[PDB]
Amino acid sequence: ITGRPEWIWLALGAALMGLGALYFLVKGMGVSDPDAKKFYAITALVPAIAFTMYLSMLLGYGLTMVPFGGEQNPIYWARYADWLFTTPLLLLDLALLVDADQGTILALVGADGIMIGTGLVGALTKVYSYRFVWWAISTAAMLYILYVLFFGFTSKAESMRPEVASTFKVLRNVTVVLWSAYPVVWLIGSEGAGIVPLNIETLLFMVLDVSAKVGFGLILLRSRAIFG
Ligand SMILES: *C/C=C(C)/C=C/C=C(C)/C=C/C1=C(C)CCCC1(C)C
Ligand SMILES: CCCCCCCC/C=C\CCCCCCCC(=O)O
Ligand SMILES: CCCCCCCCCCCCCCCCCCCC
Ligand SMILES: CCCCCC
Ligand SMILES: CCCCCC
Ligand SMILES: CCCCCC
Ligand SMILES: [Ar]
Ligand SMILES: [Ar]
Ligand SMILES: [Ar]
Ligand SMILES: [Ar]
Ligand SMILES: [Ar]
Ligand SMILES: [Ar]
Ligand SMILES: [Ar]
Ligand SMILES: [Ar]
Ligand SMILES: [Ar]
Ligand SMILES: [Ar]
Ligand SMILES: [Ar]
Ligand SMILES: [Ar]
Ligand SMILES: [Ar]
Ligand SMILES: [Ar]
Ligand SMILES: [Ar]
Ligand SMILES: [Ar]
Ligand SMILES: [Ar]
Ligand SMILES: [Ar]
Ligand SMILES: [Ar]
Ligand SMILES: [Ar]
Ligand SMILES: [Ar]
Ligand SMILES: [Ar]
Ligand SMILES: [Ar]
Ligand SMILES: [Ar]
Ligand SMILES: [Ar]
Ligand SMILES: [Ar]
Ligand SMILES: [Ar]
Ligand SMILES: [Ar]
Ligand SMILES: [Ar]
Ligand SMILES: [Ar]
Ligand SMILES: [Ar]
Ligand SMILES: [Ar]
Ligand SMILES: [Ar]
Ligand SMILES: [Ar]
Ligand SMILES: [Ar]
Ligand SMILES: [Ar]
Ligand SMILES: [Ar]
Ligand SMILES: [Ar]
Ligand SMILES: [Ar]
Ligand SMILES: [Ar]
Ligand SMILES: [Ar]
Ligand SMILES: [Ar]
Ligand SMILES: [Ar]
Q: Residue 123 belongs to a domain with what CATH number?
C-alpha cells in the first residue's frame, strides 16, 4: 500500500483536508451569528468528509480492480463516495448565500447525484467505449449545474444586497473553473484513456479538491455576505 506511487498524494490530500477542516472550525469559534454559523458548519464538514475518504484510500480501503481495454485497472471508488456528499454541500453553500428556493435546491442536488453516480457507473464499466457514454451523461449533468449557478444564481444574487452579488460571483467563477477540470482529468487519467498514470491522476484531483473545498471555503468564510 505505502509503496503504490499515488500513496504520497493521498497522504498529502488527507493532511491538507484535515488542516482545512480544523482551520474553518477554529475560525468559526469567533462567530455567533446564526446565518454565519450555518456556512461555517457546511464549509468545515466538506473537507472533514474528504479527509476521511483520503485517509480511507491511503489505508487501502475504497479500491477495486475493473477489467477494460486489455488490463486490470485499479479504480478508487471512495473518491466518488466523497464527492457524492461534498459536492451537494458546496452547492448548498451557494444556495444559502443567494437564498435559493427549496425546489431549486432539490433540482441541483438531484443533478449532482446524477453527475457523481453516472461518474461512478462509468468508472466501473467493463466495456471501454460505454465508459465514455456515462462520462458524457455525467458531463451534461455538470453543465446543467453550472448553467443554473452561472445564469440563474447570478440573477438571484443581483436582486440581493451588493455584498452577496460580489461574493457570489467570485465563488461562481471559481466553481466553473475548478468543476470543469474534473471531467478532463477523468478522460486523461487511468479511469479514462490512460494518457497519464494513476499517481498523476491522483495528484491532479488532490489539487482540484483542495482548491474546490479549502480555497472555495476561504473565499466564502472571509466574506461579510455570510452575516445575517
Ligand atoms: C470536492 C470535490 C469537488 C468539487 C468535486 C467535483 C467533482 C466533479 C465536478 C466531477 C465530475 C465528473 C464528471 C463531469 C465526468 C466524469 C466523472 C466526474 C465525476 C469526475
Ligand atoms: C462563462 C461560463 C458559463 C458556464 C455555464 C454554462 C455551461 C455550459 C452550458 C450551456 C451553454 C449555455 C449558453 C449561454 C450563452 C450566454 C448567454 C448570456 O450570456 O446571456
Ligand atoms: C515531482 C513532484 C513534485 C512535487 C511538488 C511538491 C508539491 C506539494 C504541494 C502541491 C500543492 C497541493 C495543494 C494545492 C492547493 C492549491 C489551492 C489551495 C487553496 C488554499
Ligand atoms: C447539456 C446541459 C446544459 C444546460 C442547458 C440549460
Ligand atoms: C483561493 C485562495 C483563497 C483566498 C481568499 C482571499
Ligand atoms: C477577491 C478574492 C479572489 C479569490 C480568487 C481565487
Ligand atoms: Ar506521510
Ligand atoms: Ar505527504
Ligand atoms: Ar503529508
Ligand atoms: Ar476544532
Ligand atoms: Ar465538527
Ligand atoms: Ar453541516
Ligand atoms: Ar466527516
Ligand atoms: Ar465520511
Ligand atoms: Ar470510509
Ligand atoms: Ar475506512
Ligand atoms: Ar472506503
Ligand atoms: Ar457515488
Ligand atoms: Ar460510492
Ligand atoms: Ar464510504
Ligand atoms: Ar463519504
Ligand atoms: Ar457523511
Ligand atoms: Ar459549488
Ligand atoms: Ar443545493
Ligand atoms: Ar436561485
Ligand atoms: Ar435548479
Ligand atoms: Ar427536485
Ligand atoms: Ar440543477
Ligand atoms: Ar434529490
Ligand atoms: Ar440533470
Ligand atoms: Ar448528491
Ligand atoms: Ar468521450
Ligand atoms: Ar464516467
Ligand atoms: Ar458556477
Ligand atoms: Ar476563476
Ligand atoms: Ar479557480
Ligand atoms: Ar483548474
Ligand atoms: Ar485554477
Ligand atoms: Ar467542462
Ligand atoms: Ar473544459
Ligand atoms: Ar469536459
Ligand atoms: Ar474520479
Ligand atoms: Ar483523452
Ligand atoms: Ar485517481
Ligand atoms: Ar490541477
Ligand atoms: Ar498539479
Ligand atoms: Ar487548481
Ligand atoms: Ar479557490
Ligand atoms: Ar475562514
A: 1.20.1070.10
Residue owning the nearest CA to atom 1 of ligand 39: 180
Please report whether residue 227 resides in a domain: no
Instruction: Give the closest ligand to the alpha carbon of residue 135.
Output: 33
**Phi, psi (deg, nearest 5) at residue 143:** -60, -40
CA of 198 to the centre of ligand 38 (A): 21
CA of 12 to the centre of ligand 49 (A): 21
Residue located nearest, by CA, to atom 18 of ligand 2: 151
Structural domain tally of the chain? 1
Query: Does 228 fall in a domain?
Result: no
**Cβ of 53 below 6 Å from ligand 21:** yes
Report the pocket of ligand 42 as residue ranges, CB < 6 Å: 79, 186, 191
Amino acid at 45: L
Long-range contacts formed by 76-84: CB under 8 A, 24+ apart: 76/202, 77/120, 77/123, 77/124, 78/53, 79/53, 79/205, 80/116, 80/119, 80/120, 80/123, 81/53, 82/49, 82/50, 82/52, 82/53, 82/54, 82/209, 83/116, 83/119, 84/113, 84/116, 84/117
Q: The cell 498514470 sits on which residue?
A: 197
The structure's method of determination equals X-ray
Boundaries of domain holding 58? 9-222
On whether residue 3 sits in a domain, the answer given is no
| Cβ of 105 less than 6 Å from ligand 29 | no
Quickly tell me which residue has 457546511 as its cell: 42
Say if 1 falls within a structural domain.
no
